[PDB]
Amino acid sequence: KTTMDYITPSFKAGKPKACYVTLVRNKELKGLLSSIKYVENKINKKFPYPWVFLNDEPFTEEFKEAVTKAVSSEVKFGILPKEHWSYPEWINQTKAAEIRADAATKYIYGGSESYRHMCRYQSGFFWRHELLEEYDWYWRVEPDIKLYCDINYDVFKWMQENEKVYGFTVSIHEYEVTIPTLWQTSMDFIKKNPEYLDENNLMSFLSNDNGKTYNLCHFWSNFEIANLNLWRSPAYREYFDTLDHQGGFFYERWGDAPVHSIAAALFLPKDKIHYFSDIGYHHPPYDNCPLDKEVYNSNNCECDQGNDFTFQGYSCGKEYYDAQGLVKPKNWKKFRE
Amino acid sequence: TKTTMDYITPSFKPKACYVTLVRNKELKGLLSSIKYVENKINKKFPYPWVFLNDEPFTEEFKEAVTKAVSSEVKFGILPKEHWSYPEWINQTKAAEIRADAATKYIYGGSESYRHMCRYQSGFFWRHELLEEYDWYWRVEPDIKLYCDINYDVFKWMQENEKVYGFTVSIHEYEVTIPTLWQTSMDFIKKNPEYLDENNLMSFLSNDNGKTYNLCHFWSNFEIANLNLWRSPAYREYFDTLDHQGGFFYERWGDAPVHSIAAALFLPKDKIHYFSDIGYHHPPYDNCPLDKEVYNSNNCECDQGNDFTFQGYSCGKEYYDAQGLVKPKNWKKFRE
Ligand SMILES: *[C@@H]1O[C@H](CO)[C@@H](O[C@@H]2O[C@H](CO)[C@@H](O[C@@H]3O[C@H](CO[C@H]4O[C@H](CO[C@H]5O[C@H](CO)[C@@H](O)[C@H](O)[C@@H]5O)[C@@H](O)[C@H](O[C@H]5O[C@H](CO)[C@@H](O)[C@H](O)[C@@H]5O)[C@@H]4O)[C@@H](O)[C@H](O[C@H]4O[C@H](CO)[C@@H](O)[C@H](O)[C@@H]4O[C@H]4O[C@H](CO)[C@@H](O)[C@H](O)[C@@H]4O)[C@@H]3O)[C@H](O)[C@H]2NC(C)=O)[C@H](O)[C@H]1NC(C)=O
Ligand SMILES: *[C@@H]1O[C@H](CO)[C@@H](O[C@H]2O[C@H](CO)[C@@H](O)[C@H](O)[C@H]2NC(C)=O)[C@H](O)[C@H]1NC(C)=O
Ligand SMILES: [Cl-]
Ligand SMILES: [Cl-]
Structure with missing residues (x-):
């Protein structure tokens, strides 16, 4: 019973069990409301789906009232378990503390204790929060985002019909200083669990030397429309557990983006991964803007x-297109000027 | 002997302008920025807006811009000599450096980005259209002004005798400027007269100049006196940088370049942080922490x-360098 065996069941032509999901803090209400406006105007009014909001702290009443008014579909508020936002018993907190203080000015979020709990949460726990149990699909939405174009079709229905597992917009090279031992840990996991490496994997996107080293490419997780069953699979559960035990989320600053990406690119047949070239999106500081004139004009980007x-x-668009055998747009090189 | 400040004090309505370097392909982001500037300060305190571009502007671009801006607008194209390889830079070596760094750091493989950094460092302040002004306010496309600004900022700078004003500050990625600090310190060693006795070196270094802590003012947002850049100290500093080759052999940004100059060549009380101006340039915000300012300006x-x-x-480094008291809850931002 392979990884895909846990996913194919979510591929009848009924309405997909899906939701938007947001991990946010009370101090980010204004940015969040702005993102809701984009989601509502660009797609949620047309194809309504429930929206789940998660917080490590309780939501204020003002926050909930404001969000309930801004969203036209059903909204759900949840707080996450202490066990999903705390140091594991095997982590040396004094060591973690030294690492943070030292890296405070060395790289973004280098000195942040909370940022690491967030990365760990998005890597191994969001997908098993009680509020997501009834769903097969999720669409992650961050605050301060823009949807530049109309989306005139149900994206979850589309993923279900085309049997796609992981969908993304932006991709980028990670700052290595942030993940020095992530690749080694990931390659050791594969060597130990060969059955988890899909024979038609997207290793080419992650590495230029057949896996010897990581080229640092990853899908930018702030934007994800994917199948929850991937994260619930034995392969991913065991992968996360391995990473969690190695200590990188705290001894380095492992982001959930390269973690989610390494898993998706290695545990799935590559044709299960999909790039939404047609969805206009902005998460500071990068844009995904449809290059196709028809798509751009038809959807009023x-x-x-x-x-x-x-x-x-x-x-990492070039690396992604070449690894997938996709034809790149004619003037792609203009972007490298 | 005339000093750097002697070139600036005479400039203390101000002769000021907004200035933007933009490409035809960024029209929507620019119009958005314009709407913000108009709504938050320009209709109340109008000042001319200068738009520069290394290529000619499209008619559609100029038309849209002319009507979106309430004050006078001016369009200018950049001199070819302010946007091309100087004759002493080895282009194949630069080409190799770019091809190599392409996937290594943001803009690593970009040729145009380097001409842009070199332009903001040594040439925008000498464009024909800026000659008549003493002050400028740099505005980039895709910007936000979160709050109303209820005073004339240029007038304020003038009356308070400030030379360089900023909002966001950040640590630079060292891989883009490996030899910038040594080059700058060698310049100061050879030109001790340009180092102001009461400068802001502590903002740039934790060890009195031995090493660069990488801190710099984020130049996307600048409201400053053009006479600093037109001073002998800066002209000679930029020329030294230009001949060293870092704009092309590394990836020297104008932000650290402007910052090193401002922090070493001026008395520190000539630098000002606008804690009251709400601003966003992807992906960083400056949001007024003071309650009255926030509410009064409808942030x-x-x-x-x-x-x-x-x-x-680098807000902590900045406040500490100027001896400014940090807000009581500053540590919560480090959680
Ligand atoms: C959980 O994690 C913690 C945190 O890492 C573990 O504790 C740490 O354990 C390591 C060992 O693995 C200890 O290393 C030894 O450190 C001493 C020097 O200790 C001083 O410096 C420390 C480092 O300072 C830097 O970092 C801090 C903060 O990051 C900065 O502020 C500084 O500016 C520096 O950049 C510092 O952390 C220590 O502070 C502690 O002690 C002081 C009092 O002294 C207190 O005020 C502090 O609050 C704090 O409590 C301290 O100041 C080294 O000397 C040791 O090196 C010897 O051994 C090495 C090999 O083992 C060898 O390579 C060296 O050359 C050296 O050996 C020499 O001497 C030998 C004996 O004579 C000779 O035989 C040999 O030939 C050679 O000549 C060693 O590196 C950390 O100190 C320790 N930190 C703390 C806070 O306890 C903890 O073990 C983990 N817990 C578990 C369960 O695993
Ligand atoms: C300009 O830069 C080029 C590229 O670095 C130099 O080309 C040489 O570089 C190496 C010698 O130091 C060797 O690889 C070759 O001799 C040659 N390589 C190339 C690019 O073909 C070139 O010498 C530099 N020119 C000057 C005047 O220094
Ligand atoms: Cl940070
Ligand atoms: Cl780039």
């Missing part, structure tokens, strides 16, 4: 196509 | 997202 990050050198 | 940002005192920001 509000972005500057020339600012699409996809084919910029530091993005 | 639209999340205060808890203010970048100023976050670890990777």
Whole structure:
């Protein structure tokens, strides 16, 4: 019983069991309300789906009232378990503390204790919160996001019909100083569990040397429309557990983005991964802006196509297209000027 | 002997302008920025807006811009000599450096980005259209002004005799400027007269100049006196940088370049942090922490997202350098 065996059951032509999901703090109400406006205007009014909001602290009454008014579909508020937002018993907190203090000015969120709990949460726990149990699909939405174009079709229905497992917009190279031992830990896991490496994996996106080293490319997780059953699979559960035991979420600053990406690219047949070239999106500081004129004009996009990050050198659109055998847009090189 | 400040004090309505370097492909982001500037300060305190571009502007672009801006607008194209390889830079070596760094750091493989950094460092302040002004306010596309600004900022700078004003500060990625600090210190060693006796070196270094802590003012937002850049100290500093080759052999940004100059060549009380101006340039915010300022100016940002005192920001280093008292809850930004 393979990884795909846990996922294919979610592929009848009924309405998919899906939700939007947001991990946010009370101090981010204004940015969150702004993201809701985009989601509501660009797609939720047309194809309504429940929205789940999670917080490590309780939501204020003002926050809930404001969100309930802004969202036209059903909203659900949940707080996460202490066990999913605390140091595991095997982690040396004095050591973690030293690492943070030392890295405070060395890289973004280097000195942040809470950022690491967030990365660990998005890597191994959000997908098993009680509020997501009844769903097969989720669409992660962060605060301060923009949806630049109309989306005139149900995306969850589309993923279900086309049997896609993981969908993304932006991709980028990670700062290695943030994940020095993530690749080694991940490669050791594969060597130990060969059955988990899909024979038609997307290793080419993650590495230029057949897996010897990581090229640092990953899908930018702030935007994800994927199948919850991937994370619930034995393969991923065991992968997370291994990472959790190694200590990188706290001894380094492992993000959930490279973690989710390494898993998706290695545990799935590559044709289960999908790039939404048609969804206009902005998460500071990068844009995904539809390059196709018809798609751009038909969906009234509000972005500057020339600012699409996809084919910029530091993005990983080129690596993704080549690994998937996708034909790149004619003027893709213009983005490398 | 005339000093750096002697070139600036005579400039103390001000002859000021907004200035933007933009490409035709960023029209929607620019119009958005314009709407913000108009709504938060320009209709109340109008000042001319200068738009620069290394290529000619499209008619559609100019038309849209002319009508979106309430004050006078001016369009200018950049001199070819302010946007091309100087004759002493080895282009194949630069080409190799770019091809190599392409996937290594943001803009690593970009040729245009380097000409842009070099332009903001040594040439925008000498463009024909800026000659008549003493002050400028740099505005980039895709910006937000979160709050109303109820005073004329240029006038304020003038009356308070401030030379360089900023909002966001950050630590630079060292891989883009490996030899910038040594080059700058060698310049100061050879030109001790340009180092102001009461400078802000402590903002740039934790060890009195031995090493660069990488802190810099984020140049996307600047309200300053053009006479600092037109001073002999800066002209000679930029020329030294230009001949060293870092704009092309590394990836020297104008932000650290402007910052090193401002922090070493001026008395520190000539630098000013606008704690009251709400601003966003992807992906960092400056959101007024003071309650009265926030409410009175109808700010639209999340205060808890203010970048100023976050670890990777240089707000702490800045306040400490100027002897400014940090807000009581500054540590919460480091959680
Ligand atoms: C959980 O994690 C914690 C945290 O890491 C573990 O504790 C740490 O354990 C390591 C061992 O693995 C200890 O290392 C030894 O450190 C001493 C020096 O100790 C001083 O410096 C420390 C480092 O300072 C830097 O970092 C801090 C903060 O990050 C900065 O502020 C500084 O500026 C520095 O950058 C510092 O942390 C220590 O502070 C502690 O003690 C002081 C009092 O002294 C207190 O005020 C503090 O609050 C705090 O309590 C301290 O100041 C080294 O000397 C040791 O090196 C010897 O051994 C090495 C090999 O083992 C060898 O390579 C060295 O050369 C050296 O050996 C020499 O001497 C030998 C004996 O004579 C000779 O035989 C040999 O030939 C050679 O000549 C060693 O590196 C940490 O100190 C310790 N930290 C703390 C806070 O306890 C903890 O073990 C983990 N818990 C578990 C269950 O695993
Ligand atoms: C300009 O830069 C190029 C590229 O670095 C130099 O080309 C040489 O570089 C190496 C010698 O140091 C060797 O690889 C070759 O001799 C040659 N390589 C190339 C690019 O073909 C070149 O010498 C530099 N020119 C000057 C005047 O220094
Ligand atoms: Cl930070
Ligand atoms: Cl790039």
